[PDB]
Design a protein around this ligand. Structure first.
Ligand SMILES: Nc1nc2c(ncn2[C@@H]2O[C@H](COP(=O)(O)OP(=O)(O)OP(=O)(O)O)[C@@H](O)[C@H]2O)c(=O)[nH]1
Lengths: 227, 46, 855, 97
RNA sequence: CAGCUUUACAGAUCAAUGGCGGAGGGAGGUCAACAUCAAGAACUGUGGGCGCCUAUAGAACUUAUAACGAACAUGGUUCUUGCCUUUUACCAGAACCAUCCGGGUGUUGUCUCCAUAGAAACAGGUAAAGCUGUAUUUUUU
């Protein structure tokens, strides 16, 4: 990273624009974060369904913890119909991940939980996506991120457990979280583009010689537009 | 990309007549190709 | 002519003092102090110089925000990419500053920033040569290290006035967190050490020689300066000197306006501690720790200095620095101290004699300058030259003499005691130092050091330039010696260029390197294997970078690093046998003390010999040594005193010289031998020239034979080794030392009031090869090693040369006796003396080596 | 007055609080700030290593960054029988100089 | 304990000259819109105020280098490994562009708190603030 830095310049952000000009974005409802997260999850669930509908309506159906699976009628034609894109899958995975973190928060907020457990849960989520859900099945540059997270976790655990304490109980989710955020940032724009494409579903070496031949011919034609 | 021929095209436009265009000689396969096609094919008529 | 000058002036920082005034001053000598700031590695001499520069100038260009604040140091005299990036000052880039004194007698100061890192003593040597006062700097913490002592010793040779700057008070205040009393004690100890290192003079804060400082935090002062600023309100003008005197030493102050009795009552904290160190401590503590308002109030009251509105909102370290600056004003105290130190011109004459033999000067009739260093200040090659007498105007055509052509010239002059000027030089432009610009000037003047642009073509490394107008003037003239570039090269490297289509380019670059870095014996060998003797690793690396990046820009192969070994014997010779195509000679190993003396009028010589090695009168009479290697050449048979054949020696010893230069074992020079002539069977028919020629080979052969007889050896050099470890990592260091072949720990010196075991040592230069890096890694970034060669200490390569069995492995290191030979063989191979991948050593002549020494 | 405001963009403290904060941190971010610790562990050093295809036992390794082409082919320079292998000449060195 | 400068002042003639300006706010906002981005900055050009400050706009050269951001993810093509044989999707290293994720700086406007004159000095008084001060050989006994 150090070796290859990156430069930006002039820009106008999206969120601010949305807040300002675009209806129907009314704004700044001071939500307890958990509620907001839940809402987002719900919306995510809705969106996938909508997308599916827009395509040929499938046999498969999502869980509210997003784990996509087929209802019934497992056939070749069906499979063909319902392969769709890896981008979509990635998005779904992301949503699931979000739910998992949000769900831990929710759990913490209600009973049958602890705060320590919350942190630990978060850590588990982040530092095991590889366990908890496959994005690594859909975009393998997630795998690098996952590896990094794992490494971080490893570093922490020796750092943490110099004393007699040894087991599942450990919070400190920060660097893993950061990594995940970075990954998301890396991935968002492409995902957004994909989504746009999906919605706008009605509206939009050695060939060189051939090209030359064509182009020249065209030029010639232009030159002589006679009888 | 296609710049080196533009001048040539322009020149062509300037020069030619309609009559000249009309009387462009329909071109003969100077590398007697169809004969060769005939001959190989006949040799290797399967 | 004028427009160009104006343009040049424009492309530069505008100074707080007037440049014109400075120039004017430079016309008049006694108003130009040439100072070389010189110290150990990372004393902070460059930093200090930067401070001075800052003080001088209105605004400096590259002086960014951070540097201004005081986080990063700004080294205004780093200049070059190498140096900026490296962290080391690496050449001699000084500057010229008009500075006022305590009592503002303006005086222009040619400051020169020498590098601290030992492998650049070359530069230090140059600085010394240039400078008539030498600002030694010291790290408080690391203390008076061996390096400092060495510098002092070598400065008392030069010779020069030694102003000391004890830099890094900040580190004892803040890092070591010494109690003020403890700090004072430490300082005292340091001073004592310095004094010990010195022979003649005594050094102390009183009498303006010490200058206490911390360049990180950016403040220097002398006691006197302090008194001037902040003890003139409280006392009358009559009892101020007395007060100052009282200030230093085992002296106390119990309540009494204005007495002050030596010793003592109830409470401790001496005068020094009381009126200086304690105050400093207070300042530090309030600057960091106190609420700001109170501090401000204090500063309004006690020091009469005002914190601005912005300055209150600085972060502690920067803030602290600012406070310090406010307190101790733009550093005139240092200047004052320097002035006090420099006699002046009692020493100056002596110094000049040392450089260029004793005699007498000639002002108006002829100008003479010491071309000291060639450098690359503004890209192009300049020459830093000290005009010693006369005045050198722009466009003047000037005589030149490289200090190779110096001794010879002197000899010629002596002999003399048609005109013949051997080379010349048109002086295209001249200017001042420096930092990041040459201030161009028409007139060079007797006293001032200046960069001249025409001077280069003829000379390399060091030189004497002059402009005589007569034969008498010429006769009067003396020539500077070559600079005793204290450390002396050892460390070898062999270059090839990767694509020898560009050998020429490499050669060109190599010349530049030789010029620009003057501690670089670059031998071009017979077999296309261009060689570079650096001081050491780091220096070599720097040079390589300069060459491979800037002065050449080619992919350039580089051998694993070697060293020059040299030829000497253990036992005496046993059979002087002549040679014919007729002299025989034989050599004895010299006494160690004598050798050491050599490393550092016939009757007089004899006396000296007697004093040294207990040599008899006959022995004294016989001798006639050469080269500064060292070897000694004795005319000790029976018949020679009656004979006039052995008379006329000047011719005879040419052969000996050659022999000394290029030995038998390796064509690698001879060392540490007392040669003795035993027979010179000259025939009846002379033909004198022919005879001389014969002798010239024959003598060499004889010498070789003698060496062979004497159980000869290759001598390795040894690096003397500083290591400044944290105490409990000394075992690690010891282990490391053990791990390699040659090495030794002479003395673990505990540094006063630190955790730093200054553990001096010896290491063979060969087995060094990045030793520093190894030391640092092992000792987890603790104990900066330093390797060096000031001593010119050689030693036996363990075991017996001339043994064909020797060793087992090719690729691996060889055992110690075995090694005795292996190096020799490899050296021979490198030279192009042996023939084959398997070979041996033996010396003709003759008679089958006397029938294999009679079986 | 210890910040710009509720925007929370610039912050500016006094000492004791800062000290306390530092103390609190100590367990977590005890990075040993003796600059020399990082000799052969600076970013620059790492970069150098990368461009030299060279390691440090602790440090990272890479794909070699230039075409790994030997074929020096044993000249009078860089022979076995000319140069002398007293020192092992580790990679540690190659990046440090 | 003396000096002049400034503030509060009392009533003066009131010129007079200077200052003060013929008065336009100061904060801050996870409020926007608009530019312009390493800090330079020399040097030249042109403004506005006195060999020189303050704005700009044109390159030189800088060191960037560690930190516009003590932050680090992702694309696209070309070269090169390697999966290999392929669609992604990639392993891991280059090159050059781009993509987000953040940021300042001023230009403005708007929303929440802190403000608050419409002009004073001359002549020296009162009160405070800011700096300057004991003759016997070289200055004034
Ligand atoms: N603690 C402390 N550090 C200092 C002091 N002076 C300088 N340094 C730091 O130590 C280093 C030495 O400063 P330099 O001026 O580069 O040392 P130098 O005199 O140039 O040494 P050479 O490179 O050999 O010439 C810098 O990184 C400084 O920040 C000091 O008084 N106290």
């Amino acid at each position: 990273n150090e070796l290859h830095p990156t430069l930006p310049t002039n820009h106008n952000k999206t969120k601010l624009l949305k807040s300002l000009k675009n209806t129907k974005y009314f704004q700044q409802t001071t939500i307890d974060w958990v509620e907001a997260g839940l809402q987002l999850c719900r919306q995510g669930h809705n969106m996938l369904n909508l997308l599916i509908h827009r395509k040929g309506l499938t046999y498969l159906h999502l869980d509210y913890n997003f784990n996509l699976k087929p209802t019934k009628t497992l056939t070749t034609k069906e499979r063909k119909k319902s392969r769709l894109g890896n981008s979509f899958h990635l998005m779904r995975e992301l949503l699931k991940m979000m739910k998992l973190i949000v769900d831990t928060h929710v759990q913490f907020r209600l009973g049958n939980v602890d705060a320590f457990q919350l942190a630990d849960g978060i850590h588990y989520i982040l530092n095991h996506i590889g366990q908890l859900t496959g994005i690594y099945r859909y975009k393998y540059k997630v795998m690098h991120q996952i590896r990094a997270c794992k490494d971080l976790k490893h570093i922490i655990y020796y750092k943490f457990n110099k004393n007699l304490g040894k087991g599942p109980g450990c919070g400190f989710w920060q660097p893993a979280w950061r990594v995940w955020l970075n990954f998301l940032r890396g991935t968002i724009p492409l995902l957004e583009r994909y989504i746009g494409n999906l919605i706008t579903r009605q509206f939009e070496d050695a060939y060189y010689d051939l090209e030359l031949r064509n182009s020249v011919m065209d030029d010639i034609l232009e030159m002589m537009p006679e009888s | 990309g296609n710049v080196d021929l533009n001048k040539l095209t322009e020149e062509r436009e300037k020069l030619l007549q309609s009559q000249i265009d009309e009387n462009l000689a329909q071109l003969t396969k100077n590398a007697s190709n169809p004969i060769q096609v005939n001959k190989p094919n006949a040799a290797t008529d399967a | 002519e004028h427009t160009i000058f104006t343009q040049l002036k424009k492309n530069i920082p505008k100074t707080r003092y007037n440049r014109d005034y400075m120039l004017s001053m430079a016309n008049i000598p006694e108003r130009i102090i040439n100072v070389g700031v010189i110290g150990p590695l990372h004393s902070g001499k460059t930093s200090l110089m930067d401070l001075l520069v800052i003080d001088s100038h209105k605004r400096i260009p590259d002086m960014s925000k951070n540097v201004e604040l005081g986080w990063k140091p700004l080294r205004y005299l780093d200049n070059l990419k190498q140096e900026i990036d490296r962290g080391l000052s690496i050449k001699l880039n000084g500057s010229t500053l008009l500075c006022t004194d305590l009592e503002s007698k303006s005086r222009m100061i040619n400051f020169l920033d020498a590098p601290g890192h030992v492998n650049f003593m070359d530069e230090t040597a140059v600085a010394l040569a240039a400078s008539d006062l030498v600002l030694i700097v010291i790290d408080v913490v690391e203390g008076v290290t061996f390096v400092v002592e060495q510098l002092i010793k070598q400065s008392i040779k030069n010779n020069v006035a030694m102003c000391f700057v004890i830099n890094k008070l900040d580190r004892l205040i803040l890092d070591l967190k010494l109690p003020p009393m403890d700090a004072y004690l430490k300082l005292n100890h340091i001073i004592a050490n310095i004094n010990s290192f010195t022979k003649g003079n005594v050094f102390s804060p009183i009498d303006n020689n010490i200058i206490f400082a911390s360049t990180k935090l950016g403040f220097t002062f002398t006691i006197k300066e302090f008194v001037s600023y902040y003890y003139a309100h409280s006392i009358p003008s009559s009892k101020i000197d007395d007060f100052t005197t009282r200030l230093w030493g085992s002296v106390y102050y119990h309540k009494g306006n204005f007495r002050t009795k030596p010793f003592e009552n109830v409470e401790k904290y001496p005068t020094f501690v009381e009126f200086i160190l304690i105050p400093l401590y207070k300042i530090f503590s309030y600057a960091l720790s106190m609420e700001k308002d109170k501090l401000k109030n204090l500063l309004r009251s006690n020091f009469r200095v005002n914190l601005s509105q912005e300055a209150l909102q600085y972060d502690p370290q920067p803030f602290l620095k600012h406070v310090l600056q406010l307190i101790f004003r733009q550093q005139t105290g240092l200047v004052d101290a320097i002035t006090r130190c420099y006699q002046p011109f009692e020493l100056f004459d002596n110094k000049t004699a040392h450089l260029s033999i004793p005699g007498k000067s000639t002002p108006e009739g002829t100008l003479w300058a010491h071309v000291l260093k060639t450098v690359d200040y503004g890209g192009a090659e300049w020459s830093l030259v000290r005009i010693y007498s006369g005045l050198l105007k722009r466009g003047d055509t000037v005589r030149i003499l490289d200090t190779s052509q110096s001794e010879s010239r002197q000899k010629r002059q002596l002999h003399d005691i048609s005109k013949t000027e051997t080379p010349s030089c048109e002086v295209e432009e001249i200017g001042l130092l420096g930092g990041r610009y040459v201030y161009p000037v028409h007139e060079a003047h007797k006293g001032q050091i200046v960069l001249i642009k025409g001077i280069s073509s003829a000379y390399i490394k060091s030189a004497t330039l002059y402009s005589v107008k007569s034969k008498e003037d010429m006769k009067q003239l003396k020539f500077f010696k070559p600079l005793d570039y204290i450390t002396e090269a050892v460390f070898k490297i062999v270059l090839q260029p990767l694509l020898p289509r560009e050998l020429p380019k490499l050669l060109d670059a190599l010349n530049k390197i030789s010029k620009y870095y003057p501690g670089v014996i670059i031998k071009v060998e017979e077999s296309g294997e261009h060689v570079i003797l650096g001081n050491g690793e780091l220096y070599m690396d720097c040079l390589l970078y300069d060459l491979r990046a800037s002065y050449a820009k080619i992919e350039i192969k580089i051998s694993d690093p070697l060293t020059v070994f040299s030829e000497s014997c253990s036992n005496e010779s046993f059979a002087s046998i002549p040679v014919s195509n007729s002299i025989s000679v034989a050599a004895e190993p010299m006494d160690s003390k004598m050798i050491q003396d050599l490393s550092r009028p016939r009757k007089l010589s004899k006396i000296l010999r007697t004093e040294y090695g207990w040599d008899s009168l006959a022995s004294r009479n016989v001798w006639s040594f050469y080269n500064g290697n060292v070897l000694i050449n004795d005319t000790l048979p029976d018949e020679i005193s009656p004979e006039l054949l052995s008379k006329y020696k000047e011719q005879i010893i040419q052969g000996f010289y050659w022999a000394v230069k290029e030995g038998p074992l390796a064509e690698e020079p001879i060392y540490g031998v007392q040669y003795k002539l035993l027979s010179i069977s000259v025939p009846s028919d002379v033909n004198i020239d022919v005879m001389k020629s014969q002798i010239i080979p024959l003598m060499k052969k004889a010498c070789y034979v003698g060496l062979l007889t004497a159980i000869p050896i290759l001598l390795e050099p040894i690096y003397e080794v500083d290591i400044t470890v944290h105490a409990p990592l000394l075992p690690i260091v010891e282990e490391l030392m053990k791990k390699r072949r040659g090495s030794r720990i002479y003395k673990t010196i505990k540094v006063a009031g630190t955790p730093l075991l200054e553990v001096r040592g010896q290491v063979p230069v060969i087995e060094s090869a990045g030793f520093e890096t190894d030391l640092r890694l092992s000792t987890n970034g603790l104990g900066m090693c330093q390797l060096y060669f000031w001593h010119k200490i050689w030693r036996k390569v363990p075991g017996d040369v001339l043994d064909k069995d020797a060793f087992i492995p090719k690729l691996k290191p060889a055992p110690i006796n075995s090694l005795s030979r292996d190096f020799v063989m490899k050296t021979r191979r490198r030279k192009g003396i042996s023939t084959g991948g398997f070979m041996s050593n033996d010396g003709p002549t003759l008679e089958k080596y006397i029938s294999a020494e009679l079986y | 007055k210890k910040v710009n405001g509720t925007s929370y963009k610039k912050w500016s403290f006094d000492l004791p609080e800062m000290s306390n904060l530092y103390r609190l941190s100590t367990p977590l971010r005890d990075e040993v700030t003796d600059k020399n610790y990082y000799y052969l562990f600076d970013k620059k050093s790492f970069f150098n290593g990368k461009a030299l295809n060279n390691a440090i036992p602790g440090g990272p390794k890479f794909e070699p960054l230039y075409p790994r082409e030997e074929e020096e082919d044993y000249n009078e320079f860089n022979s076995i029988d000319r140069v002398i292998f007293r020192v092992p000449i580790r990679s540690e060195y190659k990046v440090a100089f």
